[PDB]
Design a protein around this ligand. Structure first.
Ligand code: CLA
Ligand code: CLA
Ligand code: CLA
Ligand code: CLA
Ligand code: CLA
Ligand code: CLA
Ligand code: CLA
Ligand code: CLA
Ligand SMILES: CCCCCCCCCCCCCCCC(=O)OC[C@H](COP(=O)(O)OC[C@@H](O)CO)OC(=O)CCCCCCCCCCCCCCC
Ligand SMILES: CC1=C(/C=C/C(C)=C/C=C/C(C)=C/C=C/C=C(C)/C=C/C=C(C)/C=C/C2=C(C)CCCC2(C)C)C(C)(C)CCC1
Lengths: 80, 38, 151, 138, 739, 145, 72
């Protein structure tokens, strides 16, 4: 009665879709700018990730993870 | 509440007198007297 | 939305949606106490009828005679006595404050007017309670009247 | 007659009451070199206009509480303040800097009253002034 | 963002021999006895000592390190007493028949009688701290485990004490450093509470849970393997809770529900334990932990991500409130009293939440059985929470006197409400009068109707009744919550709302607490007593600076007796005197709360359950019919339950007997100070002094009656002491004798 | 002290149990337990959830005395300046309340004087002192004889 | 004549303090306005007569009630 989804497969797609959503969220609006030391990424691309500066990519991967977990476990719990 | 003692109808009216009339009047009359010129 | 009262900020009062809104100015202003024009006699009559009417309430249902066949009369008698005191309390206050002079601004606030208001309140109050009692005692009649029982 | 600019203020409840329009209210004027924030004795905060200000308060003690503040809580110590007692009859009455100079400083012209050609311990016995409306200090 | 001044103050013992050095008034010397009292009452008032906000913040910072140290010594004392002067091991063997006892009394002057028989062949004083119940749930099974814990406390104690010295005499933080609020919060929200909750969940799962599961089986402590042995053999940790076969990686693969073997949501009480499921509290703190780490990533720091509370506050303006929260950031990062005022208000209200939650949902084994510990932990945390929310009014007022600046507060929320303080109090005044009649007035209506032989008129379940329709409706929802509004929760969070009557041994651990008109009334007594206490304290904050009576009250200060007999009398207008009166009402308020608690649980909850299931309460349910008149409280609660303590002479409880009187004494003694004034007392001393001038024994430090403030401070100090000593003895003697 | 001493001793004489006083009046708990707590039993049951008897008055008067006694503590502990500042807010309320400002007091509301509060505080403290004790003296003695 | 006729100091008090202090100083004749020594005693002398009568009126109350409603 405490039923989750416990598997691989599309699990990574779920969180990566959220990582993407958050990278869209951060550039959407933020205090996006130089903080700490960022390896620097050019324009948008895979660099759209690293363009957010040092903490932002690192901070979006955080939110993107939790948003994934919240989204994954929520889809797995389904409606019943 | 009525008692055997004679004149058993006095307390019937007089407790009301002491209770409502005697105070209401004196309370009022005193209230008027504090009010005046001075 | 909340500012100074009448533009005078040093008047110890604020103008708010309760104190000085469009509504409350209208409502309170048209209440019988402040309605422009009316003679004090009618002012009190109105305030009486309203208060006397509802004042039978508590004793009619929660009085000592609630638990007998006399609850309706026990309530009326309770309201009557309560109003009588209120009348004298009114007539007395006027008798003392308005001892000296007058106040030609508001007729309600002088010896003559305030006595008219006291008298007005008395009859209004007495009438209010008595009629409300009349409807509770003959409530059976009122019931059928509304639901077309007697046609 | 004499006047000023009412300080910029949203309003408070600690202000005037019926006494102001029945018995008496007090008025206080002062001149300031700039618009700056000051504390109302009626609570809250207000800001005085640059130049002449005018303010009605309910009690004499309130005005003097503000007057002392004006003279102690500003870099330009405002000692230019004047207090009046205004009756509903229109009659006004000068009160503070009474004669002209503050009472702190001795000034010629002031008539002495309340003084005693006597030590405080040299007052008469209460039995001496028996059944007379007078007290020992009279 | 670290800034520090190196060695700002030398470390010398010269100042120790110069008392009152911290104040320029006392520094020169004592001429009267008033100097002595003033040395003590100004000791921690660091504001009045120096106006350098950097210097005081350093004093406060190292004051805390000193405090954490004594609390460590105290806490270590409890562990040491539990290790060497306890019957804990004896209690762990037979939890349901042995009474927990620490502290052995020395046989002398006949005081050995206080070492009463608590079962298990152990003589000592029966404790009500619930420490034994805490130890088991914590996984303690040996005296040595407690002993090592006691030493660790002294280590910490010494370590905390060193830090206090180090951070004021070696490396004192700059004022800039203390002002890192956004960052300070991120660490407490995640480092203290987050990791603290996560770290403890790790202990519960690896030590407490498996061990405590064996105590359900009753393996007995010595047969149970040591805590660390569960880690050396993951086979052991697997044999219980099968979900360790796939141990790690379901967490990282997000399987999670595999762990449901030991991370449950039963939501109830382990029927053998009488306490909350450790499987729940572990899953709980694991959930709280994560939530707290998360919440610790909201605020602005050095990496540009986060929030500026200054931005958030200022960006909260509305039509009704003018400029809004503008300036609130500043005053909360410049005034300590501003912070302390809030922190007390919440910490104090929280300690109350602890009490009301710990009794309905007993989190420890065999706690619910011990009605003494249940009554003792509840009323305890009640008072602490009570005292704190009074100081919340003290410093709330001190801020207004000392650190409120009109220029930095213009037409903002703070200033705006100061501009209708007369409107606030006028209504809070009325509410208190309304609650006053419509709560207490009801009891007087009953007591009078009763005596007049008119029981049909009074307010009662049997006669006319005021039914708490809502609170009852709330219970109905809480009991019907599982399988609907809480599908993954098996049973309701607390059976106080409704359900099966849980029993352990032959006693009631927890059962549905029905609400009647008897309860409706005391609830509105509580609302009444609370509102008056707020009124006294709130009025004390808003009128701290000024009034129509004294516009220059702010200049007089926070702590002053009065402004002379003028104006009809101006005694006790100060904010300090609003804390003074606020204390009596905090007391009067809570005394009724703990009296509600004691009688209600005794009468309508606690008691002995027969095997069949029928319950016999200790007061036979006389609450709902007697708790509706004062004479009923006087008779069926006080007069009745006080029989235990007054007859305690000659028993182990004889202490509570004479302590019940001791409270009474200092209570009356307090009235000596609260009813008089120093005017009389100074004149008396003059006559007394003369007798010493006569024999040449007059003291150099001239005798002086206490200050008017101290006269009041001492007054309330004794009144609240005795008032609580009395209850303290009455509750213990009562609860220990009943079970 | 005086009347407690007179009463507890005669309650032994009238009872034939002088041994009670002689053996328990040498320590304070004895007075608390044997004289106060015990001889209240009939009194506090003047009325109860079950019935009413001739001691119903004294039971009621017992609490009444307790009430006045403690109402005395207010005037004795709390002093004027607090109350004066609380009254003016009420003064404010009435002047601002519509319909009510229609009535204006001919006597300005003010807190009791300093001496007055001591006096009234003492008055209450005294009334409650005798009314509480009297109701106990009569009920305890009349109830027991 | 405002209340406290015997004290203009109190009569002028525009507050409620007048009523209270008017009562508490009523029986202190020495404080009264224009009170002489000769006019003092003459008020005391009369005040005693009224007091004696009350005592006799009181004892009359006990006798009267016992005879009327008592089982003597
Ligand atoms: C945005 C991410 C997110 C988060 C944090 C949650 C969190 C939660 N959901 Mg899920 N849900 C989501 C997305 C999310 N959901 C999506 C996209 C769907 C499909 C539309 C669902 C459908 C769903 C169903 C059907 C159910 C839930 C339920 C729950 C709760 C049950 C606990 C649990 O089993 O899971 C694991 C617990 C966690 C992952 C803890 C998360 C708590 C954190 C740390 C707070 C995060 C705050 C947020 C990120 C703040 C910034 C965002 C901003 C806009 C404010 C939990 C509060 C259950 C419920 O509550 O019933 C109504 C349930 O039955 N959800
Ligand atoms: C001071 C002595 C005294 C006291 C304490 C009482 C007390 C009482 N009387 Mg009695 N009464 C008294 C003298 C007293 N009476 C005398 C001398 C007579 C014959 C004239 C009566 C004739 C009388 C009748 C017919 C009745 C009572 C009744 C009562 C009871 C109800 C009150 C009432 O009706 O007022 C009535 C008062 C009067 C009729 C006038 C009484 C005469 C004067 C006023 C007594 C002197 C008072 C004293 C000087 C005032 C000092 C107080 C000071 C602070 C001003 C009450 C127990 C009623 C009752 O029996 O209830 C069960 C009732 O029906 N009384
Ligand atoms: C701070 C909290 C605290 C409190 C209230 C107590 C209180 C007490 N202790 Mg404990 N103690 C504490 C902390 C505390 N202790 C700590 C942290 C340690 C470890 C260093 C100890 C180690 C200790 C020992 C070894 C003993 C006590 C004993 C006692 C009792 C007698 C004290 C005494 O000898 O008179 C003071 C003499 C001068 C008394 C109940 C004695 C006891 O238990 O009775 C036999 C005892 O011998 N304590
Ligand atoms: C973070 C919160 C936390 C707290 C407050 C404690 C507290 C405690 N633990 Mg630890 N523990 C924790 C986390 C925690 N633990 C975690 C995350 C683990 C997993 C490795 C452990 C593993 C552990 C072991 C193996 C032992 C303790 C033991 C103890 C107790 C003895 C303290 C001592 O003397 O030294 C003490 C109650 C000792 C004990 O006797 O248990 C009651 C014991 O030997 N704990
Ligand atoms: C911060 C506290 C804390 C700490 C220090 C630990 C430490 C440990 N845990 Mg974890 N654990 C924790 C909290 C904690 N746990 C929480 C909150 C949960 C619930 C999600 C778990 C659930 C868990 C499982 C299922 C396992 C561990 C295991 C372990 C051990 C793995 C080391 C190894 O074998 O290689 C290690 C001692 C493993 C173990 O028991 O040792 C083999 C194991 O597989 N833990
Ligand atoms: C969060 C903790 C905390 C902290 C750090 C402070 C800190 C401070 N307080 Mg606050 N206070 C607090 C909580 C706190 N308080 C609470 C919860 C209340 C509500 C009661 C108060 C009420 C309060 C008042 C009214 C005042 C302060 C004042 C002060 C300042 C000076 C205090 C002093 O001189 O000590 C001196 C301490 C003493 C002289 C000891 C007094 C005797 C005590 C406390 C009785 C204790 C009873 C005892 C435990 C039981 C009897 C046992 C006995 C028989 C042996 C200082 C900044 C003062 C201030 O701001 O200066 C103007 C002041 O006016 N506090
Ligand atoms: C135990 C005696 C006692 C009593 C009865 C009170 C009563 C009161 N106090 Mg407290 N007070 C006390 C002790 C007491 N105090 C002590 C010892 C202190 C010092 C610590 C204080 C400090 C204090 C403060 C600081 C405050 C109060 C306030 C109040 C009032 C709150 C408003 C209210 O309840 O509405 C109505 C009154 C009652 C419900 C009391 C019962 C009255 C009855 C049952 C009515 C009787 C019927 C009717 C009058 C019959 C006619 C009789 C007539 C013909 C003579 C209330 C009058 C607060 C206040 O002023 O109001 C906001 C206030 O802030 N008190
Ligand atoms: C023996 C006869 C006697 C006489 C003729 C006087 C005469 C006088 N005294 Mg008093 N005195 C007396 C006895 C007497 N005294 C006793 C026995 C005491 C000790 C208590 C005192 C202590 C005393 C003090 C301290 C003072 C006087 C003062 C005075 C003078 C003014 C009195 C006044 O106006 O205030 C009148 C005051 C009142 C009327 C208030 C009294 C309140 C009452 C009676 C309590 C009632 C409570 C309640 C209703 C009772 C029923 C209970 C109910 C609730 C069920 C006056 C010359 C005053 C003075 O200034 O001297 C020049 C003054 O300061 N006297
Ligand atoms: C059983 C009893 C009868 C129940 C009837 C139901 C009544 C429900 C109570 C309504 C409360 C009204 C809230 C004002 C809604 C409100 O906040 O208005 C909005 C206004 C401020 O709004 P702004 O637009 O300024 O907001 C934006 C900025 O201010 C940012 O802060 O607040 C005020 O004006 C102050 C008024 C305080 C009113 C004092 C009420 C005291 C509490 C009374 C309720 C007690 C219930 C117990 C729990 C608290
Ligand atoms: C407005 C309103 C309100 C209020 C309400 C209320 C409070 C109610 C009421 C009500 C009432 C309270 C009413 C009343 C009335 C009345 C009437 C209608 C009367 C009458 C009468 C009569 C008709 C009588 C007559 C008579 C006389 C006079 C004498 C002789 C003859 C006879 C007996 C016939 C509110 C704000 C809340 C809301 C909104 C609306």
């Amino acid at each position: 009665q405490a039923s989750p989804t416990t598997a691989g497969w599309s699990l990574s797609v779920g969180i990566i879709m959220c990582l993407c959503n958050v990278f869209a969220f951060v550039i959407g609006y933020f205090a996006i700018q130089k903080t700490g030391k960022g390896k620097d990424l050019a324009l948008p691309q895979l660099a759209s990730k690293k363009t957010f500066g040092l903490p932002e990519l690192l901070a979006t991967m955080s939110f993107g993870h939790i948003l994934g977990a919240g989204m994954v476990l929520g889809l797995a719990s389904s409606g019943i | 509440m009525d008692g055997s003692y004679a004149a058993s109808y006095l307390p019937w009216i007089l407790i009301p007198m002491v209770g409502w009339l005697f105070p209401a009047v004196t309370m009022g009359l005193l209230f008027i007297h504090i009010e005046s010129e001075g | 939305v909340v500012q100074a009262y009448n533009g005078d900020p040093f008047v110890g009062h604020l103008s708010t949606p309760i104190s000085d809104s469009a509504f409350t100015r209208t409502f309170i202003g048209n209440l019988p106490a402040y309605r422009k024009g009316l003679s004090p006699i009618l002012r009190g009559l109105e305030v009486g009828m309203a208060h006397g009417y509802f004042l039978i309430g508590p004793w009619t249902l929660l009085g000592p005679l609630r638990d007998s066949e006399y609850q309706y009369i026990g309530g009326l008698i309770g309201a009557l006595a309560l109003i009588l005191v209120a009348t004298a309390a009114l007539s007395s206050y006027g008798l003392v404050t308005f001892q000296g002079e007058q106040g030609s601004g508001d007729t309600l606030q002088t010896a003559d007017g305030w006595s008219q208001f006291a008298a007005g309140f008395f009859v209004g109050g007495m009438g209010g309670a008595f009629v409300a009692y009349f409807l509770l005692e003959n409530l059976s009649v009122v019931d059928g009247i509304f639901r077309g029982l007697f046609n | 007659e004499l006047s000023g600019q009412p300080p910029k203020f949203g309003g408070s409840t600690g202000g005037l009451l019926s006494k102001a329009n029945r018995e008496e209210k007090y008025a206080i004027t002062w001149t300031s070199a700039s618009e700056q924030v000051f504390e109302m004795p009626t609570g809250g905060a207000a800001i005085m206009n640059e130049g002449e200000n005018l303010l009605y308060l309910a009690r004499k003690e309130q005005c003097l509480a503000l007057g002392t503040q004006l003279r102690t809580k500003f870099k330009p110590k405002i000692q230019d303040y004047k207090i009046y007692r205004v009756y509903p009859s229109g009659e006004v009455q000068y009160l503070h800097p009474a004669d002209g100079v503050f009472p702190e400083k001795v000034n010629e012209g002031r008539e002495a009253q309340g003084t005693k050609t006597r030590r405080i311990g040299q007052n008469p016995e209460p039995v001496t002034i028996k059944f007379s409306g007078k007290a020992p200090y009279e | 963002k670290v800034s520090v001044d190196n060695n700002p103050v030398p470390t010398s013992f010269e100042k120790w021999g110069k008392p009152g050095h911290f104040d320029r008034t006392l520094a020169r010397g004592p001429k009267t006895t008033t100097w002595i009292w003033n040395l003590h009452a100004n000791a921690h008032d660091f504001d009045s000592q120096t106006s350098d906000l950097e210097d005081v913040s350093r004093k406060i910072f190292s004051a805390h390190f000193g405090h954490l140290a004594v609390v460590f010594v105290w806490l270590s004392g409890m562990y040491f007493h539990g290790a060497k002067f306890s019957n804990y091991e004896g209690w762990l063997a037979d939890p349901t028949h042995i009474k927990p006892s620490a502290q052995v009394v020395w046989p002398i002057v006949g005081q050995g009688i206080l070492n009463g028989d608590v079962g298990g062949g152990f003589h000592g004083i029966q404790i009500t701290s619930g420490l034994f119940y805490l130890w088991r749930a914590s996984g303690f099974t040996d005296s040595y485990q407690l002993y090592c814990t006691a030493i660790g406390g002294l280590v910490m104690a010494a370590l905390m004490l060193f830090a206090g010295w180090f951070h004021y005499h070696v490396k004192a933080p700059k004022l800039e450093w203390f002002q890192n609020v956004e960052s300070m919060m991120n660490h407490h929200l995640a480092g203290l509470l987050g990791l603290g909750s996560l770290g403890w969940a790790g202990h519960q799962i690896h030590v407490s849970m498996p061990i405590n599961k064996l105590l359900d089986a009753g393996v007995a402590p010595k047969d149970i393997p040591l805590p660390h042995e569960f880690i050396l053999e993951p086979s052991k940790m697997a044999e219980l809770y099968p979900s360790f076969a796939q141990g790690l990686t379901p967490f990282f693969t997000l399987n999670w529900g595999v762990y449901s073997d030991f991370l449950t949501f039963k939501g109830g009480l382990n029927p053998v334990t009488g306490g909350l499921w450790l499987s729940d509290t572990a899953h709980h703190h694991l959930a709280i932990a994560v939530l707290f780490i998360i919440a610790g990533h909201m605020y602005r720091t050095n990496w540009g991500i986060g929030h500026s509370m200054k931005e958030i506050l200022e960006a909260h303006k509305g039509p009704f409130t003018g400029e809004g929260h503008k300036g609130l950031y500043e005053i909360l990062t410049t005034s300590w009293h501003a912070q302390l005022a809030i922190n007390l208000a919440l910490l104090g209200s929280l300690t109350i939440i602890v009490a009301q939650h710990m009794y309905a949902m007993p989190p420890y084994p065999y706690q619910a059985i011990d009605y003494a510990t249940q009554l003792s932990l509840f009323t305890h945390h009640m008072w602490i929470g009570g005292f704190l929310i009074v100081g919340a009014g003290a410093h709330g007022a001190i801020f207004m006197v000392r650190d409120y600046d009109p220029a930095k507060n213009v037409n903002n929320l703070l200033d705006r409400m100061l501009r209708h303080r007369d409107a606030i109090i006028s209504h809070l005044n009325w509410v208190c009068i309304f609650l006053g009649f419509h709560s207490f007035g009801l009891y007087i209506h009953n007591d009078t109707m009763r005596a007049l032989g008119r029981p049909q008129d009074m307010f009662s379940d049997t006669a006319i009744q005021l039914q708490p329709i809502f609170a009852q409706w709330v219970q109905h929802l809480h009991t019907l919550a599982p399988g609907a509004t809480a599908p993954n929760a098996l049973a309701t969070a607390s059976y106080a709302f409704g359900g099966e009557t849980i029993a352990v041994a032959g006693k009631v651990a927890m059962m549905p607490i029905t609400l009647g008109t008897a309860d409706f009334m005391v609830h509105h007594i509580h609302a009444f007593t609370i509102h008056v206490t707020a009124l006294i304290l709130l009025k004390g904050v808003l009128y701290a600076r000024s009034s129509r009576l004294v516009p220059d009250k702010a200049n007089l200060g926070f702590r002053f007796p009065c402004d002379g007999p003028g104006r009809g009398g101006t005694c006790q207008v100060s904010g300090w005197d609003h804390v003074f009166l606020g204390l009596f009402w905090m007391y009067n308020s809570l005394s009724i709360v703990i009296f509600h608690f004691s009688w209600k649980m005794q009468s309508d909850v606690w008691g002995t359950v027969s095997p069949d299931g029928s319950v016999t309460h200790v007061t036979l349910g006389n609450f709902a019919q007697s708790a509706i008149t004062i004479n009923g409280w006087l008779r069926d609660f006080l007069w009745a339950q006080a029989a235990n303590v007054i007859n305690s002479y000659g028993s182990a409880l004889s202490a509570y007997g004479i302590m019940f009187l001791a409270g009474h004494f200092v209570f009356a003694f307090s009235l000596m100070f609260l009813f008089s004034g120093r005017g009389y007392w100074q004149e008396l001393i003059e006559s007394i002094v003369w007798a010493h001038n006569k024999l040449n024994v007059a003291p150099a430090i001239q005798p002086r009656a206490l200050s008017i403030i101290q006269g009041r401070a001492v007054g309330v100090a004794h009144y609240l002491l005795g008032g609580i000593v009395t209850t303290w003895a009455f509750f213990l003697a009562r609860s220990l004798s009943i079970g | 002290w005086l009347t407690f001493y007179w009463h507890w001793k005669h309650l032994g004489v009238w009872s034939g149990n002088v041994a009670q006083f002689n053996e328990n009046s040498t320590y304070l708990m004895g007075w608390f337990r044997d004289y106060l707590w015990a001889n209240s039993a009939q009194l506090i049951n003047g009325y109860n959830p079950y019935g009413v008897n001739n001691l119903s008055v004294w039971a009621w008067m017992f609490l009444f005395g307790h009430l006045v006694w403690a109402t005395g503590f207010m005037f004795l502990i709390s002093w004027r300046g607090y109350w004066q500042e609380l009254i003016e807010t009420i003064v404010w309320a009435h002047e601002r309340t519509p319909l009510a400002n229609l009535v204006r007091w001919k006597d300005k509301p003010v807190a009791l004087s300093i001496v007055q509060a001591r006096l009234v505080g003492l008055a209450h403290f005294t009334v409650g002192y005798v009314l509480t004790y009297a109701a106990f003296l009569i009920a305890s003695t009349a109830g027991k004889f | 004549t405002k209340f406290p006729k015997f004290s203009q100091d109190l009569a002028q008090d525009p507050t409620t303090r007048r009523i209270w202090y008017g009562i508490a100083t009523a029986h202190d004749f020495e404080t009264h306005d224009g009170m002489t020594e000769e006019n003092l005693y003459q008020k005391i002398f009369a005040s005693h007569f009224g007091h004696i009568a009350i005592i006799f009126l009181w004892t009359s109350g006990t006798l009267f009630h016992v005879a009327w409603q008592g089982n003597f």
